[PDB]
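Model it.
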Amino acid sequence: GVSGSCNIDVVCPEGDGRRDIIRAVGAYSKSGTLACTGSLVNNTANDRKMYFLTAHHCGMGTASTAASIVVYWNYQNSTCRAPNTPASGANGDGSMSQTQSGSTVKATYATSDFTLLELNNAANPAFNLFWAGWDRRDQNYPGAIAIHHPNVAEKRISNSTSPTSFVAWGGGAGTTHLNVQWQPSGGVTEPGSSGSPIYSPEKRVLGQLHGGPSSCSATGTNRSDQYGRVFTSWTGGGAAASRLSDWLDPASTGAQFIDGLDS
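Modeled.
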């Protein structure tokens, strides 16, 4: 696939130290057509349940559209293309043969823009999947890591080394979203990155991508994106079908944050 040249292949050194969470992220199609990004999340029972977080606005939060999902794992360029060179903006060499079809909806909620799916098939050992931790504490972070499929093309990583801030979707005062500022020549996100996770520096999911003004040519504060918060989604819309808590802490441990689980 093809995406902006400012984007960074995951096999690049920017991925060092992150090779676990890189394996949590997948691209998917909706009714046959490449659509959005999602990622695996761990839960307190540590049971490898195929909980796949994505964004509500991608339209997977109905029984019918969830059934149509095809997820493509390990879809990334074989070699590091140097960021901001035309090599990075050229068609990549990713494989799309590691797939699984079908899911059900566990919860969906428009305000913090989250859908939790459960994939029908248990993890194939050959796909070497990872279930990432999460952090639901009401706070900001000194930076953040995005792993995503821009234009639903080969997997990329984008780093933020600026503090996050709370916003409402659109950028007004609010607390439902995290605002993330990209580096001035670093990776960004692009259509199809929607639903992709944002991770704290400790590699725990904080939210999933709603959208925002970023592109490889964006300057200043337009080089940014907004992520629906796990904090907000935890309580969500006030019942199991519209929140994360029942699914991610089934053991009622009361955990504020957890780490990941390897396959």
